[PDB]
Amino acid sequence: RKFDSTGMFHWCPDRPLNDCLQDRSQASASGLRNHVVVCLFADAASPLIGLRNLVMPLRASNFHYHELKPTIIVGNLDYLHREWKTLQNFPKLSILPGSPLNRANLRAVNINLCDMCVIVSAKDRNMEDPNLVDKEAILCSLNIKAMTFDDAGANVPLITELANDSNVQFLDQDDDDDPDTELYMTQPFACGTAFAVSVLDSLMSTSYFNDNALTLIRTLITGGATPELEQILAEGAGMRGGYCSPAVLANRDRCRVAQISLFDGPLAQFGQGGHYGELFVYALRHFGILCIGLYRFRDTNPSSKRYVITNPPEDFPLLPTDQVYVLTYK
Amino acid sequence: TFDDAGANVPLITELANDSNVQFLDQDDDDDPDTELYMTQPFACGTAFAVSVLDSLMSTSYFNDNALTLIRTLITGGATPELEQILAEGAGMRGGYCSPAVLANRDRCRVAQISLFDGPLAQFGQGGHYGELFVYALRHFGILCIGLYRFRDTNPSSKRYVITNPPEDFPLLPTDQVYVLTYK
Amino acid sequence: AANIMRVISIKNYHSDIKVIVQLLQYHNKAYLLNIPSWDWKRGDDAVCVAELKLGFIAQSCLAPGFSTLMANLFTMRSYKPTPEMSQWQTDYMRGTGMEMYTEYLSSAFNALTFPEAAELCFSKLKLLLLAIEVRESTLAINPGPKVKIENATQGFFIAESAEEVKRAFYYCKNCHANVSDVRQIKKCKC
Numbered sequence: 100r101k102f103d104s105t106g107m108f109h110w111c112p113d114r115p116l117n118d119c120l121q122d123r124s125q126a127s128a129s130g131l132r133n134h135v136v137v138c139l140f141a142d143a144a145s146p147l148i149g150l151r152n153l154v155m156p157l158r159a160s161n162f163h164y165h166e167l168k169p170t171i172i173v174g175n176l177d178y179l180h181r182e183w184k185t186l187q188n189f190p191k192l193s194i195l196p197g198s199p200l201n202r203a204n205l206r207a208v209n210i211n212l213c214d215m216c217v218i219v220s221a222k223d224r225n226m227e228d229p230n231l232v233d234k235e236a237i238l239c240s241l242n243i244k245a246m247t248f249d250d251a252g253a254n255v256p257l258i259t260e261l262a263n264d265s266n267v268q269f270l271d272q273d274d275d276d277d278p279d280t281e282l283y284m285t286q287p288f289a290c291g292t293a294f295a296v297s298v299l300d301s302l303m304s305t306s307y308f309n310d311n312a313l314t315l316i317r318t319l320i321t322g323g324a325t326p327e328l329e330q331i332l333a334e335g336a337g338m339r340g341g342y343c344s345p346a347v348l349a350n351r352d353r354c355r356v357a358q359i360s361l362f363d364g365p366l367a368q369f370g371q372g373g374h375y376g377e378l379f380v381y382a383l384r385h386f387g388i389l390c391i392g393l394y395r396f397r398d399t400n401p402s403s404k405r406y407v408i409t410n411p412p413e414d415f416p417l418l419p420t421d422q423v424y425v426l427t428y429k
Numbered sequence: 430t431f432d433d434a435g436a437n438v439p440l441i442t443e444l445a446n447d448s449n450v451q452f453l454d455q456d457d458d459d460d461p462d463t464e465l466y467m468t469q470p471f472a473c474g475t476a477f478a479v480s481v482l483d484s485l486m487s488t489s490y491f492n493d494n495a496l497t498l499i500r501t502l503i504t505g506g507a508t509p510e511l512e513q514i515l516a517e518g519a520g521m522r523g524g525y526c527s528p529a530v531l532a533n534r535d536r537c538r539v540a541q542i543s544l545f546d547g548p549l550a551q552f553g554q555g556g557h558y559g560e561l562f563v564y565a566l567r568h569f570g571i572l573c574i575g576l577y578r579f580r581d582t583n584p585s586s587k588r589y590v591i592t593n594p595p596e597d598f599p600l601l602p603t604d605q606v607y608v609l610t611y612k
Numbered sequence: 613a614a615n616i617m618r619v620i621s622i623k624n625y626h627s628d629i630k631v632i633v634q635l636l637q638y639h640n641k642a643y644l645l646n647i648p649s650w651d652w653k654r655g656d657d658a659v660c661v662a663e664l665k666l667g668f669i670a671q672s673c674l675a676p677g678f679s680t681l682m683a684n685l686f687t688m689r690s691y692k693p694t695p696e697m698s699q700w701q702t703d704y705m706r707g708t709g710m711e712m713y714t715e716y717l718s719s720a721f722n723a724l725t726f727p728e729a730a731e732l733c734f735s736k737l738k739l740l741l742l743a744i745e746v747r748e749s750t751l752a753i754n755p756g757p758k759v760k761i762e763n764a765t766q767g768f769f770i771a772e773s774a775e776e777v778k779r780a781f782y783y784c785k786n787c788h789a790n791v792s793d794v795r796q797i798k799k800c801k802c
């Protein structure tokens with residue numbers, strides 16, 4: 100396998116977009132499963148969102164090549180040519196041209212078999228009134244939930260970027276919506292189905308009060324980008340890579356965030372009526388697995404939705420259906 | 430002119446502003462304050478505008494079933510199934526079809542027929558609309574819903590609509606009748 | 613896009629409210645058909661202005677003037693002559709006073725064929741019967757002798773007012789409506 104010059108990401112030599120371009124026939128002929136679908140809304144002239152930053156963490160050299168999730172971008176082809184210059188060095192990446200609102204595109208890309216659908220708008224985020232600004236993101240989300248694959252609908256996992264945080268109320272049903280709750284309290288955000296820029300602006304004050312802690316987030320969130328990699332890109336030559344030395348390949352053995360289930364395997368004994376404190380100590384001792392929180396079903400009985408629980412108390416009761424967020428080294 | 434007929438050719442005009450209907454024809458005796466539906470070009474069926482449709486809000490509320498009656502007719506028989514197949518984004522799927530679905534070809538349509546000649550001409554020759562209605566329904570299953578009558582009787586080609594005339598309404602041999610029909 | 617967002621908002625607040633929406637473009641109707649809680653079987657309904665407009669116009673290509681007949685039939689108007697009105701305008705305007713209505717057919721229609729029920733409504737009641745909702749249920753327009761009127765059949769009518777159409781619901785047993793001076797039809801059928 101090949102990597103970038105700092106050995107942090109998997110890499111390809113430069114290639115033209117039509118090597119990665121697919122028709123609906125080609126996309127549906129491909130065995131797409133456990134993939135990431137990027138539903139991209141863009142005009143050909145609209146500003147670059149930098150899909151490099153979405154794809155690059157999914158290509159961290161932390162992973163084996165066989166466990167890299169393949170990625171398909173569904174969107175405007177003239178826009179994608181413009182970004183392609185930055186994307187062309189990543190493996191297991193393809194493009195289906197045309198609107199993400201079209202159901203034949205979503206079925207051709209096996210939307211029901213993906214591990215994540217990412218709904219993002221590159222359009223200006225300022226057009227018309229504050230209701231219209233999220234029209235495609237809301238309609239795409241609702242359109243995906245309304246489909247059936249009986250030939251599963253709301254069982255497919257979505258993450259939606261919102262231009263106006265107030266539009267979060269339209270993303271789901273039986274939320275009991277209020278206009279005056281902050282975004283972070285709303286059910287779609289608590290479930291991890293929604294995101295917005297407004298949750299990030301405290302990174303000004305955290306960057307001031309502890310610089311080191313901002314590097315902690317980024318090592319994780321970028322999948323391991325570095326000042327060296329940022330400088331190599333700022334040199335304007337594009338992402339240089341190739342075969343690499345055993346000395347730089349040592350950077351593959353680094354920590355990553357993972358999510359694991361208490362339903363089965365050695366930790367299932369804790370899902371069967373144990374407590375979070377027991378699980379934490381056991382997983383740290385036996386595996387070096389450091390637990391940081393829970394992802395729990397909202398309702399217990401019929402919906403698929405789950406919610407985050409950052410760092411529970413030690414006497415917090417577990418369920419066999421719980422999943423736990425973990426820092427992990429292999 | 431086509432002498433190698435002019436105003437004899439049938440037109441339907443979509444109007445963006447209903448007030449412009451007055452420019453469509455001559456000797457209309459135009460007024461700015463008559464509603465579109467009273468104007469001669471609309472009464473003849475030469476003009477149309479969106480402003481005649483907006484009462485379909487209140488009819489959709491007061492009888493949903495009656496909006497499906499209009500649409501079955503006006504779309505030529507589109508259905509929720511066809512609307513869903515198009516909303517699936519694949520385009521209008523088709524091919525050869527089964528005898529079971531081909532049964533939908535035997536359905537009612539609106540047609541227009543003349544009292545000048547054929548079996549119904551006996552009513553155009555000085556009969557009454559009530560006689561015509563009962564006869565056509567009994568002998569043919571043809572259900573008459575109104576008349577399309579020449580505006581002037583003598584020299585112009587224009588005709589006007591008469592929705593559901595009275596039973597004692599006198600017919601003319603030049604009349605045409607709107608009919609619901611099954612073949 | 614604004615009107616679709618309004619339906620999305622209304623149905624996010626409560627899914628089961630009947631929403632009737634006016635749309636200007638037919639391709640935008642696909643977006644609200646894909647809303648998770650939109651259902652035509654509850655009577656959620658998109659009145660598409662472009663779909664209707666062009667379908668009324670297409671109907672005049674098949675039967676000239678039918679756009680005017682059918683468009684007049686779907687707004688409430690009442691006749692009202694004037695002395696300045698020419699006789700062709702009085703005929704036209706008398707026709708514009710009629711619009712589409714729905715009523716239950718009385719028990720006296722039960723087990724007639726549709727053609728017999730239409731003859732009866734017209735020749736006696738002065739009412740033009742177009743169609744019936746056949747029991748799930750389906751709308752049948754001018755159906756042949758092969759269909760009977762059931763008990764409690766909804767019929768579709770052309771008449772000058774709803775209070776005129778109510779003759780088809782009040783319509784007596786034949787014993788109580790032989791005289792046919794139609795204003796005399798009233799609820800005292802038995």
Ligand SMILES: [Ca+2]
Pocket residue numbers: 267268269270271272273274275276624
């Ligand atoms: Ca909601």
Ligand SMILES: [Ca+2]
Pocket residue numbers: 450451452453454455456457458459
């Ligand atoms: Ca004029």
Ligand SMILES: [Ca+2]
Pocket residue numbers: 688689690691708709710711771772773
């Ligand atoms: Ca009326």
